[PDB]
Design an enzyme around this catalytic site. Structure first.
Site, PDB file in Angstrom:
ATOM      1  N   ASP A  96      -1.294  -3.783  10.448  1.00  0.00           N
ATOM      2  CA  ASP A  96      -2.310  -4.708  10.069  1.00  0.00           C
ATOM      3  C   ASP A  96      -2.798  -5.699  11.130  1.00  0.00           C
ATOM      4  O   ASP A  96      -1.858  -6.609  11.322  1.00  0.00           O
ATOM      5  CB  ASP A  96      -2.648  -5.032   8.710  1.00  0.00           C
ATOM      6  CG  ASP A  96      -2.695  -3.976   7.586  1.00  0.00           C
ATOM      7  OD1 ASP A  96      -2.653  -4.146   6.599  1.00  0.00           O
ATOM      8  OD2 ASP A  96      -3.090  -2.771   8.072  1.00  0.00           O
ATOM      9  N   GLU A 181     -10.547  -3.767  -5.444  1.00  0.00           N
ATOM     10  CA  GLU A 181     -10.984  -2.610  -6.188  1.00  0.00           C
ATOM     11  C   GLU A 181     -10.573  -3.015  -7.552  1.00  0.00           C
ATOM     12  O   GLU A 181      -9.476  -3.699  -7.796  1.00  0.00           O
ATOM     13  CB  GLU A 181     -10.131  -1.515  -5.641  1.00  0.00           C
ATOM     14  CG  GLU A 181     -10.823  -0.944  -4.180  1.00  0.00           C
ATOM     15  CD  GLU A 181     -10.078   0.393  -3.677  1.00  0.00           C
ATOM     16  OE1 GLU A 181      -8.844   0.635  -3.891  1.00  0.00           O
ATOM     17  OE2 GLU A 181     -10.903   1.018  -3.195  1.00  0.00           O
ATOM     18  N   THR A 337     -16.170   5.883  -3.577  1.00  0.00           N
ATOM     19  CA  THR A 337     -15.632   6.160  -1.993  1.00  0.00           C
ATOM     20  C   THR A 337     -15.165   7.680  -2.093  1.00  0.00           C
ATOM     21  O   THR A 337     -15.813   8.582  -3.051  1.00  0.00           O
ATOM     22  CB  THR A 337     -14.296   5.261  -1.769  1.00  0.00           C
ATOM     23  OG1 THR A 337     -13.874   5.474  -0.380  1.00  0.00           O
ATOM     24  CG2 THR A 337     -13.155   5.586  -2.653  1.00  0.00           C
ATOM     25  N   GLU A 375     -18.950   4.910  -0.344  1.00  0.00           N
ATOM     26  CA  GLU A 375     -18.633   4.816   0.808  1.00  0.00           C
ATOM     27  C   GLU A 375     -17.738   6.013   1.470  1.00  0.00           C
ATOM     28  O   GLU A 375     -17.334   6.689   0.718  1.00  0.00           O
ATOM     29  CB  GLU A 375     -17.541   3.393   1.090  1.00  0.00           C
ATOM     30  CG  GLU A 375     -18.161   2.362   0.398  1.00  0.00           C
ATOM     31  CD  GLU A 375     -17.156   1.096   0.552  1.00  0.00           C
ATOM     32  OE1 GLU A 375     -18.044   0.020   0.389  1.00  0.00           O
ATOM     33  OE2 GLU A 375     -16.125   0.894   0.390  1.00  0.00           O
ATOM     34  N   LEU A 378     -12.184   7.373   4.648  1.00  0.00           N
ATOM     35  CA  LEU A 378     -11.130   7.354   6.074  1.00  0.00           C
ATOM     36  C   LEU A 378     -12.390   7.210   7.098  1.00  0.00           C
ATOM     37  O   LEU A 378     -13.276   7.643   6.862  1.00  0.00           O
ATOM     38  CB  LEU A 378     -10.311   8.536   5.971  1.00  0.00           C
ATOM     39  CG  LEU A 378      -9.269   8.507   5.079  1.00  0.00           C
ATOM     40  CD1 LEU A 378      -8.578   9.892   4.830  1.00  0.00           C
ATOM     41  CD2 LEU A 378      -8.321   7.324   5.374  1.00  0.00           C
TER      42      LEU A 378
HETATM   43  O1  LIG Z   1      -5.609  -0.407   7.034  1.00  0.00           O
HETATM   44  C1  LIG Z   1      -5.227   0.858   6.398  1.00  0.00           C
HETATM   45  C2  LIG Z   1      -6.378   1.812   5.946  1.00  0.00           C
HETATM   46  O2  LIG Z   1      -7.325   0.864   4.876  1.00  0.00           O
HETATM   47  C3  LIG Z   1      -8.324   1.643   4.247  1.00  0.00           C
HETATM   48  O3  LIG Z   1      -7.500   2.864   3.736  1.00  0.00           O
HETATM   49  C4  LIG Z   1      -7.772   3.131   2.463  1.00  0.00           C
HETATM   50  C5  LIG Z   1      -8.608   4.401   1.815  1.00  0.00           C
HETATM   51  O4  LIG Z   1      -9.906   4.164   1.993  1.00  0.00           O
HETATM   52  C6  LIG Z   1      -8.260   4.942   0.739  1.00  0.00           C
HETATM   53  O5  LIG Z   1      -8.811   6.355   0.569  1.00  0.00           O
HETATM   54  C7  LIG Z   1      -6.361   5.003   0.660  1.00  0.00           C
HETATM   55  O6  LIG Z   1      -6.122   6.046   1.438  1.00  0.00           O
HETATM   56  C8  LIG Z   1      -5.403   7.167   1.207  1.00  0.00           C
HETATM   57  C9  LIG Z   1      -6.226   8.212   1.557  1.00  0.00           C
HETATM   58  O7  LIG Z   1      -7.479   8.488   0.742  1.00  0.00           O
HETATM   59  C10 LIG Z   1      -5.280   9.521   1.446  1.00  0.00           C
HETATM   60  O8  LIG Z   1      -5.926  10.846   1.882  1.00  0.00           O
HETATM   61  C11 LIG Z   1      -4.055   9.551   2.230  1.00  0.00           C
HETATM   62  O9  LIG Z   1      -4.348   9.185   3.696  1.00  0.00           O
HETATM   63  C12 LIG Z   1      -3.897  10.469   4.522  1.00  0.00           C
HETATM   64  C13 LIG Z   1      -4.888  10.982   5.176  1.00  0.00           C
HETATM   65  O10 LIG Z   1      -5.823  11.794   4.194  1.00  0.00           O
HETATM   66  C14 LIG Z   1      -4.678  11.610   6.670  1.00  0.00           C
HETATM   67  O11 LIG Z   1      -5.677  11.823   7.208  1.00  0.00           O
HETATM   68  C15 LIG Z   1      -3.656  10.953   7.379  1.00  0.00           C
HETATM   69  O12 LIG Z   1      -4.398   9.664   7.840  1.00  0.00           O
HETATM   70  C16 LIG Z   1      -4.306   9.592   9.198  1.00  0.00           C
HETATM   71  C17 LIG Z   1      -5.746   9.284  10.017  1.00  0.00           C
HETATM   72  O13 LIG Z   1      -6.172  10.651  10.527  1.00  0.00           O
HETATM   73  C18 LIG Z   1      -6.146   8.203  11.069  1.00  0.00           C
HETATM   74  O14 LIG Z   1      -7.309   7.729  10.781  1.00  0.00           O
HETATM   75  C19 LIG Z   1      -5.202   7.110  10.975  1.00  0.00           C
HETATM   76  O15 LIG Z   1      -5.591   6.043   9.775  1.00  0.00           O
HETATM   77  C20 LIG Z   1      -5.542   4.735  10.403  1.00  0.00           C
HETATM   78  C21 LIG Z   1      -7.149   4.429  10.290  1.00  0.00           C
HETATM   79  O16 LIG Z   1      -7.837   4.983  11.409  1.00  0.00           O
HETATM   80  C22 LIG Z   1      -7.357   3.007  10.053  1.00  0.00           C
HETATM   81  O17 LIG Z   1      -8.623   2.531  10.059  1.00  0.00           O
HETATM   82  C23 LIG Z   1      -6.590   2.151   9.362  1.00  0.00           C
HETATM   83  O18 LIG Z   1      -6.814   2.867   8.033  1.00  0.00           O
HETATM   84  C24 LIG Z   1      -7.524   1.844   7.066  1.00  0.00           C
HETATM   85  C25 LIG Z   1      -8.530   2.576   6.624  1.00  0.00           C
HETATM   86  O19 LIG Z   1      -9.741   2.804   7.791  1.00  0.00           O
HETATM   87  C26 LIG Z   1      -9.344   1.850   5.330  1.00  0.00           C
HETATM   88  O20 LIG Z   1     -10.553   2.623   4.977  1.00  0.00           O
HETATM   89  O21 LIG Z   1      -5.211   2.551   9.526  1.00  0.00           O
HETATM   90  C27 LIG Z   1      -4.667   3.746   9.466  1.00  0.00           C
HETATM   91  C28 LIG Z   1      -3.267   3.884   9.873  1.00  0.00           C
HETATM   92  O22 LIG Z   1      -2.470   4.161   8.725  1.00  0.00           O
HETATM   93  O23 LIG Z   1      -3.749   7.498  10.774  1.00  0.00           O
HETATM   94  C29 LIG Z   1      -3.464   8.159   9.375  1.00  0.00           C
HETATM   95  C30 LIG Z   1      -2.015   8.512   9.063  1.00  0.00           C
HETATM   96  O24 LIG Z   1      -1.238   7.593   8.389  1.00  0.00           O
HETATM   97  O25 LIG Z   1      -2.466  10.510   6.664  1.00  0.00           O
HETATM   98  C31 LIG Z   1      -2.798   9.737   5.451  1.00  0.00           C
HETATM   99  C32 LIG Z   1      -1.323   9.746   4.719  1.00  0.00           C
HETATM  100  O26 LIG Z   1      -0.782   8.340   4.717  1.00  0.00           O
HETATM  101  O27 LIG Z   1      -3.365   8.318   1.902  1.00  0.00           O
HETATM  102  C33 LIG Z   1      -4.040   7.216   2.086  1.00  0.00           C
HETATM  103  C34 LIG Z   1      -3.137   5.868   1.822  1.00  0.00           C
HETATM  104  O28 LIG Z   1      -2.183   5.731   2.456  1.00  0.00           O
HETATM  105  O29 LIG Z   1      -5.744   3.904   0.962  1.00  0.00           O
HETATM  106  C35 LIG Z   1      -6.233   3.219   2.135  1.00  0.00           C
HETATM  107  C36 LIG Z   1      -5.283   2.085   2.281  1.00  0.00           C
HETATM  108  O30 LIG Z   1      -5.735   0.903   1.321  1.00  0.00           O
END
Ligand SMILES: OC[C@H]1O[C@@H]2O[C@H]3[C@H](O)[C@@H](O)[C@@H](O[C@H]4[C@H](O)[C@@H](O)[C@@H](O[C@H]5[C@H](O)[C@@H](O)[C@@H](O[C@H]6[C@H](O)[C@@H](O)[C@@H](O[C@H]7[C@H](O)[C@@H](O)[C@@H](O[C@H]1[C@H](O)[C@H]2O)O[C@@H]7CO)O[C@@H]6CO)O[C@@H]5CO)O[C@@H]4CO)O[C@@H]3CO
Length: 486
Positions: A96, A181, A337, A375, A378
């Site tokens: 982060d 949340e 979301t 919202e 991802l």
């Molecule tokens: O700063 C971290 C993160 O914070 C916020 O994310 C939340 C999110 O909104 C919640 O939904 C929950 O996330 C869950 C997912 O819902 C769940 O599916 C799973 O995620 C997996 C994905 O499904 C899968 O695609 C992959 O994720 C990839 C992804 O392709 C990339 O986009 C990349 O992620 C990075 C983001 O680009 C970056 O913005 C930030 O993420 C924020 C996010 O924007 C915000 O909304 O950092 C991440 C890097 O970690 O790479 C990832 C690979 O890890 O794999 C994941 C499996 O881990 O699980 C997540 C929780 O892990 O919770 C998050 C966190 O509060």
């Protein structure tokens, strides 16, 4: 006349909109980015108003300087503003970039009283947020947590009164837990959880233990304890006797614990929303809460990850309609979301059903007469994501001569960056906004708000829980939008 189909689009500002030093130092960059949002027809922006920045010096030493500069810039861009009362840590996980803890002087109380933090069965303290168990405990130089939240909101209203009166600030989202949340910190990504683990129950702080003991004694079971057959963060449900199919979650003791755990979240939201409603009484704003989107394990009987987050949701028990019923007296909205997710995009092993979960939460809010916004979970820049959002925004498509039967009250895109507003990303985003607006120009007058009335009569937890059963089917959602990006 398709005007009633218009869905507002907001864009979340960067997490660093205000620096970690509580200074506004990226004004010129932001102004340039906001020009691009204005070119796209965006209705407004959304921003975290970080407790650790504003009340960082000491109790009641609020420093609103940076936020006022930010809000003036947004006003001068002709954009509306949704403000999050962010009573939680920003960042602190691996990788982060922006790290903003809750105020140090609040954390100092934790040296002599570590039970101010949600605590797991291992004893691990989560330092991102104050346990709901201290909501009404006067531990913080004479104030309780709820008093601190109320006082912060009062100071915000006083300082930001001109932006309220001018119609710039139109929504206040009340942060109610980690990540803002209304949940427990059951999936701690940098301290022992990885997706799609079931998570854990985070109810071991001494305040919540004492509350469970009292609850159990009131029903003649003083001997009951938290379930111990629950495995650990990275388990799957069948690894455990509690969460397995036909497991102990179904038992009398299991039901009592799950109701207690989820009810405490509902009560936390109710008492803080009551204070927020008193603060903002008479202002033309919507109050909102943010419900976390726990889509993993939705397909299995135990809904294990929802349970550990605090959402007591099962095939026959609507664990979101109870929350919705609690919000009704406040005229509060739900901000949800996962609006961009298709089930086919998720890994099989996660037993994940974001579409169905979104349909459930939206339907629950609408049945309780609430506004519901959403919202994306991802980051996504692609047409398919936008078209999934569009479907969720107007589940029954366009009504040609009036308002549709259901629609989102707004959508907030996470999140503004330089990458969003260039190239193909920007072209896709602008077309999305057009479609959300039913191909109409931006309407600065849309969705006017009456002065906020006082919350209706407090209702008991038993009254709220009438909403849990019978569980109703969701309203029908079209498979695909009738107004795609193209
Ligand atoms: O700063 C971290 C993160 O914070 C916020 O994310 C939340 C999110 O909104 C919640 O939904 C929950 O996330 C869950 C997912 O819902 C769940 O599916 C799973 O995620 C997996 C994905 O499904 C899968 O695609 C992959 O994720 C990839 C992804 O392709 C990339 O986009 C990349 O992620 C990075 C983001 O680009 C970056 O913005 C930030 O993420 C924020 C996010 O924007 C915000 O909304 O950092 C991440 C890097 O970690 O790479 C990832 C690979 O890890 O794999 C994941 C499996 O881990 O699980 C997540 C929780 O892990 O919770 C998050 C966190 O509060």
């Amino acid at each position: 006349n398709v005007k009633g189909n218009y869905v507002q689009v907001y864009v979340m500002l960067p997490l660093d909109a205000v620096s970690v030093n509580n200074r506004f130092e990226k004004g010129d960059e932001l102004r340039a980015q906001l020009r691009k949002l204005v070119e796209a027809g965006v209705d407004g922006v959304m921003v975290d108003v970080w407790w650790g920045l504003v009340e960082g010096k000491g109790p009641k030493a609020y420093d609103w300087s940076a936020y006022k500069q930010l809000f003036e810039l947004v006003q001068k861009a002709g954009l509306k503003l949704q403000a999050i009362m962010s009573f939680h840590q920003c960042g602190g996980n691996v990788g982060d970039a922006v790290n903003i803890p809750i105020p140090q002087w609040v954390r100092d109380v934790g040296t002599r009283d570590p039970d101010i933090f949600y605590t797991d069965g291992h004893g691990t303290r989560n330092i991102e947020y104050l346990t709901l168990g201290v909501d009404n405990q006067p531990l913080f130089h004479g104030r309780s947590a709820v008093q601190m939240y109320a006082d912060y909101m009062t100071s915000f209203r006083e300082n930001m009164k001109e932006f309220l009166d001018a119609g710039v600030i139109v929504d206040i989202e009340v942060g109610l837990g980690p990540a803002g949340e209304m949940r427990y910190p059951s999936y701690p990504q940098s301290h022992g959880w990885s997706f799609p683990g079931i998570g854990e129950f985070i109810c071991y702080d001494k305040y919540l233990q004492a509350d469970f003991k009292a609850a159990a004694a009131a029903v003649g079971h003083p001997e009951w304890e938290f379930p111990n057959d629950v495995g650990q963060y990275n388990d799957t449900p069948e690894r455990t006797q509690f969460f397995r199919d036909n497991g102990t979650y179904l038992s009398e003791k299991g039901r009592f614990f799950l109701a207690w755990y989820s009810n405490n979240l509902i009560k936390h939201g109710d008492r803080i929303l009551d204070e927020a409603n008193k603060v903002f009484l008479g202002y033309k704003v919507q109050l909102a809460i943010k419900i976390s989107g726990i889509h993993w394990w939705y397909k299995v009987p135990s809904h294990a990850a929802e349970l550990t987050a605090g959402y007591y949701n099962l095939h026959d028990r609507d664990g979101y309609r109870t929350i919705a019923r609690m919000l009704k007296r406040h005229r509060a909205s739900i901000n949800f979301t996962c609006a961009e997710m298709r089930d086919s995009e998720q890994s099989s092993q996660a037993m994940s059903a974001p579409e169905e979960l979104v349909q459930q939460v939206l339907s629950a809010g609408w049945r309780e007469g609430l506004n519901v916004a959403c919202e994306n979970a991802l980051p996504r820049y692609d047409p398919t994501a936008y078209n999934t959002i569009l479907r969720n925004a107007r589940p029954h498509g366009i009504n040609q001569s009036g308002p549709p039967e259901h629609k989102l009250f707004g959508f907030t895109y996470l999140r503004l960056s330089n990458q969003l507003v260039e190239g193909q990303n920007y072209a896709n985003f602008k077309t999305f906004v057009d479609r959300m607006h039913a191909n109409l120009p931006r309407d600065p007058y849309v969705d006017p708000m009456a002065p906020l009335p006082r919350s209706g009569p407090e209702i008991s937890i038993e009254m709220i829980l009438q909403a849990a059963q019978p569980k109703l089917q969701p309203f029908p959602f079209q498979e695909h939008t009738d107004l795609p990006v193209g």
